[PDB]
Ligand binder design. Structure first.
Ligand SMILES: CCCCCCCCCCCCCCCCC[C@@H](O)O[C@H](CO[C@H](O)CCCCCCCCCCCCCCC)COP(=O)(O)OCC[N+](C)(C)C
Lengths: 69, 175
């Protein structure tokens, strides 16, 4: 029965080790992402949460019919 | 027989007396024993002889599995899942081996109580004391862990006990 239907314990053991590593990495990545989102939303210095401002390319820098703009 | 270790499963030298008949009457037990022997024990023995003749022709063996010693839960850092996994598997195997040790000691105790007859209260004191020592140790290690036990909870229990013992010894030294 053991020869025909199953494997040794080392296979399940090391598959479990691989599964555990994947899951623990995913967990720490999730926590880190939550912290990064908190900081990027509070500070606005990150690539995320960039709210539009006015394009400076719309300003007209030509003499404006009076000297003081 | 020699199949099992007589050091783990010991028994006394098995003193039995010799028959000292006191009457001319025939003992029906011995006649019944001869009848039983020559009607039951000889055919069974022959059948077993044939069975073992067929067994010897095809002889194959199996091997007890040996497990290395990996680092335990004390030398795993807090979030290292692989060290924790191997330590927890090792702790579980050790828990199973300790259960079997207590089982062996209990088997000794029971065999002694049965064997010693009317004198079990005095003749099985060493077996009882041995069980008491083993039971105390096993209780300290695993009792009150609950279901969902783990090596970390066993370590926390040990550390609590060690703190209490250290503080007791320290205040005894001030006495
Ligand atoms: C010797 C006589 C006395 C003792 C009898 C022993 C009893 C054993 C027979 C009972 C059958 C066992 C039930 C099947 C469960 C096993 C399912 C699965 O685990 O088996 C797979 C293997 O497949 C097997 O073939 C299972 C198929 C069994 C299907 C049963 C169907 C029987 C129906 C009977 C119909 C008969 C004719 C009908 C006439 C109308 C494993 O997949 P695999 O990927 O390998 O895993 C890797 C393991 N390796 C490395 C060892 C290869």
């Amino acid at each position: 029965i053991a020869r025909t239907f199953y494997d040794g314990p080392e296979k399940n053991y090391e598959k479990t080790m691989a599964i555990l590593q994947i899951e623990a990495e995913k967990a720490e990545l999730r926590l880190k992402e939550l912290e990064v989102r908190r900081l990027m939303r509070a500070r606005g210095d990150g690539p995320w949460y960039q709210y539009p401002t006015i394009d400076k390319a719309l300003i007209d820098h030509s003499p404006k019919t009076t000297p003081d703009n | 027989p020699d199949s099992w270790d007589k050091d783990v499963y010991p028994e006394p030298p098995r003193r039995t007396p010799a028959p000292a008949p006191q009457t001319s009457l025939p003992n029906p037990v011995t006649y019944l024993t001869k009848i039983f022997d020559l009607l039951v024990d000889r055919p069974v023995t022959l059948a077993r002889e044939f069975i073992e003749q067929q067994h010897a022709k095809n002889r194959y063996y199996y091997y007890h599995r040996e497990f290395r010693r990996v680092p335990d839960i004390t030398e795993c850092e807090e979030k290292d899942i692989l060290c924790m996994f191997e330590a927890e598997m090792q702790w579980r195997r050790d828990y199973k081996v300790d259960q079997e040790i207590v089982n062996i000691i209990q088997e000794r105790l029971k065999a002694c109580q049965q064997r010693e007859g009317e004198s079990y209260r005095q003749n099985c004191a060493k077996e009882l004391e041995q069980f008491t020592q083993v039971s105390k140790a096993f209780q300290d290690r695993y009792s009150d862990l609950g279901a969902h036990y783990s090596a970390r909870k066993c370590l926390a229990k040990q550390k609590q006990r060690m703190l209490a013992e250290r503080k007791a010894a320290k205040e005894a030294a001030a006495a």
